[PDB]
Design a protein around this ligand. Structure first.
Ligand SMILES: O=C(O[C@@H]1Cc2c(O)cc(O)cc2O[C@@H]1c1cc(O)c(O)c(O)c1)c1cc(O)c(O)c(O)c1
Ligand SMILES: O=C(O[C@@H]1Cc2c(O)cc(O)cc2O[C@@H]1c1cc(O)c(O)c(O)c1)c1cc(O)c(O)c(O)c1
Ligand SMILES: O=C(O[C@@H]1Cc2c(O)cc(O)cc2O[C@@H]1c1cc(O)c(O)c(O)c1)c1cc(O)c(O)c(O)c1
Ligand SMILES: O=C(O[C@@H]1Cc2c(O)cc(O)cc2O[C@@H]1c1cc(O)c(O)c(O)c1)c1cc(O)c(O)c(O)c1
Ligand SMILES: O=C(O[C@@H]1Cc2c(O)cc(O)cc2O[C@@H]1c1cc(O)c(O)c(O)c1)c1cc(O)c(O)c(O)c1
Ligand SMILES: O=C(O[C@@H]1Cc2c(O)cc(O)cc2O[C@@H]1c1cc(O)c(O)c(O)c1)c1cc(O)c(O)c(O)c1
Lengths: 116, 117, 116, 117
């Protein structure tokens, strides 16, 4: 019953991206970003436990993934400072979100799988 | 001659993404995002002439593509509010940057092609 | 202990792609493709049980995914006849392979996560 | 004037993919793949002049990009043998096709942009 999960893959090595830091924010009434949650990806390239179904209310959310530090650790100079995923959550009721990020040094793709 | 251009494709239609609004910011000394340029893509899904070789100094830049408005205009309710590409530019000297975005309602990818003038 | 798994996602709807047919082949001595396994994706957009670690020997493999029939079922005329993933398997010993395909009507991406 | 072109980008380097070999086939009446055209990408990662508006009749075509040789030449051992794009062309009348491929060692994406002459 985890409603927000993030999965990061490394397209160069073909493996999960481990130890990728990410920060999750929610848009405040004053249109600024308020810190919500944070963590680092597991050995499976995943991050769970960001929030509970109860705390995860309708809102605009941002997931910032520190892709630059990941590549620098591997000795590669990347293009992006980080990867941002910005989205409206739960506007039609509660959903479970899996955000996937696929990383290359000069390119990334992000996809959402949203289920009921 | 143009140091920063953006190309946007539509993965649903198999076509350039037309009339996609974009905003560019540059990070100021104070750590805030200062507006830097804007525009919309043409019939070829491209936006050129955002800045000049002389004005586009070293800095951290953000290109914000209003993908949500793009999809809504087509009657589609997509996942993302927008697509944002944040990068340091010109730190090892001047380069030409092409930012390419490929859009689907629930997914997008972005790639940079960076070449030495 | 499943060594070859395929996961298909729909980038338009943001959901697993369910009931996508796929066929798996291995390159024969006579450089032709020999049928190996087949199936359709589950409600989770996944296909397992294609092979066992014992039967999955070093070889060149092809996974053909019938993306065209999937889109036609949804009333969309797609570009590709199907998506092909062609790769050498197990050349350095046994690995577990997860092949992911992300589908849009005029674009697809494929990624491999290979673990030990 | 050119009805079929291919653009290949390198997602590791942030650059066009140069000297990528490609082979195109067309499905024959007998269900076999008959060789149709070939070439390599230029310095701009593009391959043009594969066929002519007149020769590129309705059919099922396959573009096979030798991504494995590309990566090996760079010292990298990638996952795929090649990238293959199989599609029906010109079934609703003549169109112009651009096949775009974005390459990483363990991932690639391919997109078609199809426009009406
Ligand atoms: O400490 C804030 O962020 C932390 C530092 C930081 C940064 O330096 C640059 C950046 O790209 C992201 C970033 O995330 C950090 C962060 C820390 C957390 O503990 C956290 O829960 C989070 O969501 C994120 C913060 C505080 C704020 O009060 C605030 O309004 C805000 O927008 C942000
Ligand atoms: O009508 C457009 O597509 C069709 C309607 C549609 C939709 O309502 C919601 C959605 O999730 C997907 C979607 O795909 C439809 C579609 C139908 C086709 O026959 C087709 O070949 C195709 O590429 C696609 C269209 C036009 C456009 O001009 C456009 O840019 C675009 O992205 C899409
Ligand atoms: O956003 C600012 O203006 C516009 C409104 C707007 C918005 O409502 C939401 C959003 O996602 C983006 C956004 O971009 C707009 C914008 C317009 C421009 O003409 C422009 O050059 C630009 O950089 C951007 C802005 C930002 C700022 O950070 C700022 O300090 C300021 O004075 C102004
Ligand atoms: O029956 C063969 O394939 C089946 C029909 C078929 C097709 O018509 C077009 C196409 O794109 C793919 C395709 O896969 C089918 C198939 C069926 C299976 O049961 C299977 O295990 C498999 O791998 C795949 C076959 C037999 C052969 O003897 C053979 O050499 C071969 O290459 C293929
Ligand atoms: O040396 C090239 O990259 C570096 C070496 C390398 C490798 O040995 C294996 C691998 O898995 C990835 C890889 O990334 C390296 C890399 C280093 C950088 O500093 C960098 O900015 C970058 O984009 C990347 C190179 C040159 C190229 O000309 C090229 O086309 C290419 O794709 C790559
Ligand atoms: O592959 C044929 O020639 C070349 C060798 C070759 C290969 O070893 C492996 C592979 O992945 C692709 C491949 O393409 C080659 C090829 C060369 C060309 O000049 C060409 O126009 C073409 O379509 C293709 C071929 C295929 C056939 O199906 C065929 O009937 C034939 O007579 C010949």
């Amino acid at each position: 019953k985890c409603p927000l999960m993030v999965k990061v893959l490394d397209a160069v090595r073909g493996s999960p991206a481990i130890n990728v830091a990410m920060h999750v924010f929610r848009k405040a009434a004053d249109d600024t970003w308020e810190p919500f949650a944070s963590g680092k990806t597991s050995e499976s390239g995943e991050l769970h436990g960001l929030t509970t179904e109860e705390e995860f209310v309708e809102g605009i959310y941002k997931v910032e993934i520190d892709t630059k530090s990941y590549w620098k650790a591997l000795g590669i100079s990347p293009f992006h400072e980080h990867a941002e995923v910005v989205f409206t959550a739960n506007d039609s009721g509660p959903r479970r979100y899996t955000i996937a990020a696929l990383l290359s040094p000069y390119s990334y793709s992000t996809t959402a799988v949203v289920t009921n």
